[PDB]
Amino acid sequence: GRDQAGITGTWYNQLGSTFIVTAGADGALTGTYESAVGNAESRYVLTGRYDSAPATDGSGTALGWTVAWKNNYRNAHSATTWSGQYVGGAEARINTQWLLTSGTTEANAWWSTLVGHDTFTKVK
Amino acid sequence: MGRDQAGITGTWYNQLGSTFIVTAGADGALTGTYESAVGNAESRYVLTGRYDSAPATDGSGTALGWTVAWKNNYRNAHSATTWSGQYVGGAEARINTQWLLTSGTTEANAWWSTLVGHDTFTKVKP
Amino acid sequence: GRDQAGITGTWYNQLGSTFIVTAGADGALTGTYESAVGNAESRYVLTGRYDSAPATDGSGTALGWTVAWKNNYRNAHSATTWSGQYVGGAEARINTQWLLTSGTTEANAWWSTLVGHDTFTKVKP
Amino acid sequence: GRDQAGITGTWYNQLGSTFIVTAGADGALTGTYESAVGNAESRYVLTGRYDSAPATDGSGTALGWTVAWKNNYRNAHSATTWSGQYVGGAEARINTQWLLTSGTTEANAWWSTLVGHDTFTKVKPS
Numbered sequence: 044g045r046d047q048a049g050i051t052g053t054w055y056n057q058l059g060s061t062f063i064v065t066a067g068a069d070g071a072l073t074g075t076y077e078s079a080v081g082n083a084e085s086r087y088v089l090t091g092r093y094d095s096a097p098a099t100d101g102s103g104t105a106l107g108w109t110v111a112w113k114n115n116y117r118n119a120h121s122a123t124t125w126s127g128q129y130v131g132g133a134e135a136r137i138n139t140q141w142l143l144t145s146g147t148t149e150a151n152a153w154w155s156t157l158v159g160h161d162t163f164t165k166v167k
Numbered sequence: 168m169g170r171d172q173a174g175i176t177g178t179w180y181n182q183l184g185s186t187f188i189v190t191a192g193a194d195g196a197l198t199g200t201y202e203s204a205v206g207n208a209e210s211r212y213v214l215t216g217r218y219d220s221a222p223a224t225d226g227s228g229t230a231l232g233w234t235v236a237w238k239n240n241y242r243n244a245h246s247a248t249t250w251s252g253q254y255v256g257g258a259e260a261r262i263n264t265q266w267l268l269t270s271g272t273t274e275a276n277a278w279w280s281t282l283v284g285h286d287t288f289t290k291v292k293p
Numbered sequence: 294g295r296d297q298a299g300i301t302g303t304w305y306n307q308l309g310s311t312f313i314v315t316a317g318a319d320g321a322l323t324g325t326y327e328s329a330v331g332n333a334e335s336r337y338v339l340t341g342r343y344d345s346a347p348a349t350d351g352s353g354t355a356l357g358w359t360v361a362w363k364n365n366y367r368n369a370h371s372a373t374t375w376s377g378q379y380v381g382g383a384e385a386r387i388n389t390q391w392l393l394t395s396g397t398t399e400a401n402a403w404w405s406t407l408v409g410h411d412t413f414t415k416v417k418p
Numbered sequence: 419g420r421d422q423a424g425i426t427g428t429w430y431n432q433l434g435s436t437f438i439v440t441a442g443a444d445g446a447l448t449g450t451y452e453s454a455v456g457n458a459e460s461r462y463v464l465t466g467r468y469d470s471a472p473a474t475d476g477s478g479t480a481l482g483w484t485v486a487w488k489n490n491y492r493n494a495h496s497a498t499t500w501s502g503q504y505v506g507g508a509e510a511r512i513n514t515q516w517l518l519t520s521g522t523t524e525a526n527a528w529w530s531t532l533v534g535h536d537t538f539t540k541v542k543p544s
């Protein structure tokens with residue numbers, strides 16, 4: 044993939060969260076996520092997909108990934124999905140939006156899902 | 168094994184007739200394929216995701232999510248959909264999701280890059 | 294306003310909430326919302342906008358409204374916006390997605406905002 | 419306490435859209451929005467609500483407003499609702515998440531809604 048080199052590596056969000064990922068040539072994202080916020084301790088497995096043949100009009104590369112917030116330290120009974128685009132060049136960034144869904148009883152389902160945005164850069 | 172690995176592993180159908188075949192792994196992995204029924208999509212695309220392999224036993228649903236990049240060997244729509252939701256098991260087993268579809272865009276068009284919606288998957292055709 | 298009549302009146306969500314609205318010829322939505330879930334006691338003011346000259350190809354009518362969850366009896370320090378479209382006809386619906394934002398500290402901002410959907414109908418489910 | 423004066427005024431988002439708004443004592447927001455992107459020309463009416471009695475623990479003031487993209491110059495068959503919170507003081511700002519829905523056929527309904535986020539400050543941007 045074209046941005047397999049630019050994607051693979053270590054990324055930091057605005058809050059201090061760290062994302063390490065390897066971009067496969069087929070389009071896989073594999074890695075670990077470590078949150079600066081929430082009911083999270085240490086690293087959690089991340090799996091994802093990216094467009095491995097983007098357009099060539101200076102358009103970004105579409106990707107997305109999931110982290111379920113269970114590891115050998117803790118279980119928040121929740122999962123976050125990040126949807127977004129990788130932009131490369133001088134100040135590469137992954138700009139995302141996300142949905143964090145918690146497992147709830149039916150009664151509480153209406154309030155199961157938070158939404159937000161995250162920008163990741165190669166430096167922080 | 169995961170508590171809902173057997174419940175989750177299988178074929179799922181949403182309200183639009185899109186179909187998703189997933190294997191739940193013991194660790195929390197979800198792997199499989201998605202066939203969309205709407206938009207710039209043709210045949211099967213790879214899906215990868217994660218689920219809570221040890222959910223609450225208070226009768227809460229099981230948190231999960233998965234991602235489809237809309238490239239396969241026949242088409243590329245330059246976009247990706249992430250589904251975030253939860254699995255409820257039983258006779259009327261379902262997966263309730265909210266989703267995000269991001270297209271690759273220029274910076275001028277970034278502001279309108281991401282669609283939002285909701286899908287409900289059941290084990291039967293709608 | 295084309296769907297001014299079809300929009301005006303009482304609507305119900307699948308969760309037993311009710312919304313009463315008057316659609317003005319100007320594209321105003323005015324009315325009140327009465328909850329069935331959340332820190333929500335009784336009636337709350339609603340204000341919003343609708344497209345008063347829709348397309349004529351069988352497309353819906355875009356609209357949105359806000360409720361700040363403060364009335365004379367309770368205050369949840371939060372607000373919901375509903376963005377959606379009105380579809381009229383035999384089985385008239387208003388299909389929405391919404392954002393519920395709570396007032397927070399900067400520390401807790403990242404989890405200020407919940408997201409969901411609701412479908413409103415003219416008949417009480 | 420009441421941020422009527424704080425909220426009331428001229429705001430600009432990161433893309434140079436302008437938002438003139440008057441907060442009322444009853445929790446009303448009224449004014450105009452002029453966009454810098456999309457099918458928009460000049461000013462559109464906005465109406466909304468804010469919490470007229472917010473917490474006193476450093477919390478922001480929850481708010482929300484709507485613009486239907488119809489005026490005497492253009493009709494884009496859509497509406498945007500912003501949901502967010504006002505924070506006063508230095509770097510007084512309104513942080514929002516937004517949903518933009520267009521009227522569609524039932525066939526195109528799955529992709530009727532865009533999502534994003536906007537931050538408004540009183541300083542017009544670059």
Ligand SMILES: O=C(CCCC[C@@H]1SC[C@@H]2NC(=O)N[C@@H]21)Nc1cccc(S)c1
Pocket residue numbers: 056058060077078079080081082083112119121123141143145159161403404
């Ligand atoms: O605690 C967790 C699980 C880990 C949170 C990580 C999130 S994912 C989006 C954002 N971006 C980051 O980097 N970190 C945060 N969830 C949860 C559920 C319900 C209420 C609350 S307060 C917290």
Ligand SMILES: O=C(CCCC[C@@H]1SC[C@@H]2NC(=O)N[C@@H]21)Nc1cccc(S)c1
Pocket residue numbers: 181183185203204205206207208237244246248266268270286528529
């Ligand atoms: O065409 C595609 C890619 C495949 C769409 C499948 C979606 S994913 C969420 C939802 N759930 C399903 O089962 N199907 C739909 N994207 C795209 C981008 C920009 C404008 C438009 S119209 C379409």
Ligand SMILES: O=C(CCCC[C@@H]1SC[C@@H]2NC(=O)N[C@@H]21)Nc1cccc(S)c1
Pocket residue numbers: 153154306310328329330331332333362369370371373391393395409411
């Ligand atoms: O729940 C409320 C106030 C009542 C709204 C309930 C929602 S608004 C969208 C949807 N449509 C309905 O009719 N009901 C639901 N506030 C609140 C604030 C902070 C945290 C939490 S959990 C709850």
Ligand SMILES: O=C(CCCC[C@@H]1SC[C@@H]2NC(=O)N[C@@H]21)Nc1cccc(S)c1
Pocket residue numbers: 278279431433435453454455456457458487494495496498516518520534536
């Ligand atoms: O073009 C418009 C009307 C103006 C949208 C401006 C947006 S509202 C959220 C964000 N915040 C701003 O300040 N600007 C942007 N609607 C429309 C309809 C159908 C398809 C598409 S792509 C766009």
